[PDB]
Amino acid sequence: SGAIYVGNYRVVNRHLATHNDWANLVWEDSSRDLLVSSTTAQGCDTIARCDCQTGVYYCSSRRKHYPVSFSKPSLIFVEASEYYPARYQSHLMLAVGHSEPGDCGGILRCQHGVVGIVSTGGNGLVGFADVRDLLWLDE
Ligand SMILES: COc1ccccc1[C@@H](C)C(=O)N1CCC[C@H](C(N)=O)C1
Ligand SMILES: [Zn+2]
Structure with missing residues (x-):
């Protein structure tokens, strides 16, 4: 959450x-x-407006924050779950790190502010939904 x-x-x-x-x-x-x-x-909160590819995220299943290197926002295939059919999720950034059911919603931050929120997990990967392109959040 x-x-x-x-x-x-x-x-x-x-x-x-x-x-x-x-x-x-x-x-x-x-x-x-x-x-x-x-x-x-x-x-x-403050939203980052930047191209950082490193930051720190909160992992609720470990009660800990972890540093991560993550990919640029992109279109990635996500397997079917109880919430969505199998589909391509857009504006998603992946990193190596722990994420299980329940970790969605944890914030990823860089030195400029909030970058995005945990949206996918499994297989020793963690995926974040980017929010840096949503300029209207600031007005
Ligand atoms: C079956 O879900 C998992 C299994 C292992 C580990 C983690 C998960 C969860 C976090 C996950 O990645 N998703 C379920 C909620 C919607 C997500 C999405 N964005 O489509 C996908
Ligand atoms: Zn930044």
């Missing part, structure tokens, strides 16, 4: 969005596993 809170927006994994997220929907994209909802309170 986990979310980004920036301005009057909440960014979550689309497959973990609640009834309240859907009732306050701003934007969603199944191909990216992202959903953004509106909030009444002002958020706690």
Whole structure:
């Protein structure tokens, strides 16, 4: 679990969005596993606007943060799960690291701010849904 809170927006994994997220929907994209909802309170987070390929992510299944080198946002095949059919997920970045069911929503940060959230795992890999291209989150 986990979310980004920036301005009057909440960014979550689309497959973990609640009834309240859907009732306050701003934007969603199944191909990216992202959903953004509106909030009444002002958020706690800053979004990175950069091309960093290293950072640190939070892994809830270890209660620890790990440093990672990750690929640039790209179109990657993701196997079927209970939440999606087998498909290509866009704007996804991969790295070597631990991620299991439950770790989705953990934040990946570089020195400039939030980069994205955990969206895929298994096989000693961890995948992050990028949010750095969503410039409107800042306004
Ligand atoms: C079967 O899921 C796992 C198995 C081992 C390890 C980890 C997982 C989880 C985290 C995972 O990668 N996904 C399930 C939730 C939606 C994800 C997506 N973006 O399509 C895919
Ligand atoms: Zn950066």
